């Protein structure tokens, strides 16, 4: 497919939201990413 | 048009409006259909004017017959703004009434006769 500049921006964001809760946050809160979307098992909008 | 049963030659109309202009400065004049109507009714009308470019026509349809059952003379005028200006208004006037001419009773009288003869 051919994506637009906007679609590409959205895909970029989703890829980013797909990162882990940093190590320090675990310590800072004395102790999950409920938005872990897998490219195969999951499906994105559009 | 529906209330107009005869045609007033340009010249006559000219003399008529001329008379009206002096009438306002010497004698008295009534400007406005409502004020003209009350003249014809109160009899204090010597000569009444009525435009032909009036829309809606209802505003004047009555003038003819009213004036005819009151013996008051009337004449038609093509323009509406000329009658208004001749009366001394910065606006137009659908109808006007010469309430007692002034230094023009001679002309008015004649203009009246000319129309009567014009049937």
């Amino acid at each position: 497919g051919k994506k637009s500049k906007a679609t590409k921006k959205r895909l970029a964001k989703l890829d980013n939201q797909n990162s882990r809760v940093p190590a320090w946050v675990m310590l800072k809160t004395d102790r999950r990413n409920h938005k872990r979307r897998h490219w195969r098992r999951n499906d994105t909008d559009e | 048009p529906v209330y107009v049963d005869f045609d007033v030659p340009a010249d006559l109309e000219d003399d008529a409006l001329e008379a009206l202009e002096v009438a306002r400065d010497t004698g008295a004049v009534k400007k406005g259909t409502n004020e003209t109507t009350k003249s014809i009714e109160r009899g204090s009308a010597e000569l009444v004017f009525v435009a032909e470019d009036v829309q809606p026509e209802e505003i004047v349809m009555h003038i003819p017959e009213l004036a005819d059952e009151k013996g008051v003379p009337f004449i038609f005028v093509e323009q509406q703004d000329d009658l208004g200006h001749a009366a001394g208004l910065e606006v137009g006037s659908a109808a006007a009434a010469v309430t007692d001419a002034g230094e023009a009773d001679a002309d008015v009288e004649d203009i009246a006769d000319k129309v009567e003869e014009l049937r």
Partner: protein
């Protein structure tokens, strides 16, 4: 003595007689060629207009609206209906043609508000009405002690809420006594039975 106005009125009591008759036979011809909503410089019935609130003044507008004659233009049922509800031909709308006309006009002038309206005749397939509208934003009107009332916020879209004269009669609000049990203070508060 009689006002000149009284003559316009007296003529319109019989729009099918005299000079008015011939006048209408002519006008409608032009009217049938105009649109659905035509703005006009002067009311066809001065006496009526003035009687209803009209005034030769800035912010006061008049428009002639044409509307089809007859019952409701209804589509037949496309699902089950008991015989009582299978009608199409005899069903008529609960809003009279004059109100339809007042609404078509107000929509045409989104910024204006309906003041009143009156009939100006009909041929065999349509009726014409002249509607008087007002510019609630023009200072010439905001300063008129006899009209500035229509400038208030709660008078917005008054025609669509039945606050018009024709709107109120059609709502059965004329009678203050017997017969108006289900109409006043409103049709809706009375469970729509009036």
């Amino acid at each position: 003595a009689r006002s000149a106005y009284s003559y316009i009125r007296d003529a319109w009591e019989n729009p099918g007689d005299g000079q008015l008759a011939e006048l209408q036979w002519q006008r409608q011809q032009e009217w049938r060629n105009e649109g659905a909503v035509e703005r006009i410089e002067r009311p066809t019935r001065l006496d009526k207009a003035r009687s209803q609130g009209y005034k030769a003044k800035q912010g006061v507008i008049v428009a002639r609206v044409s509307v089809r004659k007859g019952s409701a233009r209804k589509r037949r049922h496309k699902a089950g209906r008991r015989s009582k509800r299978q009608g199409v031909t005899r069903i008529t709308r609960r809003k009279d043609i004059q109100r339809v006309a007042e609404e078509r006009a107000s929509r045409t002038f989104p910024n204006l508000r309906v003041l009143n309206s009156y009939s100006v005749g009909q041929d065999g397939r349509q009726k014409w009405h002249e509607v008087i509208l007002i510019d609630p934003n023009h200072p010439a009107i905001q300063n008129d002690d006899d009209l500035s009332w229509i400038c208030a916020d709660d008078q917005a879209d008054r025609v669509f809420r039945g606050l018009t004269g024709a709107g109120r009669r059609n709502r059965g609000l004329s009678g203050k006594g017997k017969g108006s049990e289900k109409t006043r203070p409103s049709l809706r508060s009375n469970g729509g039975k009036a």
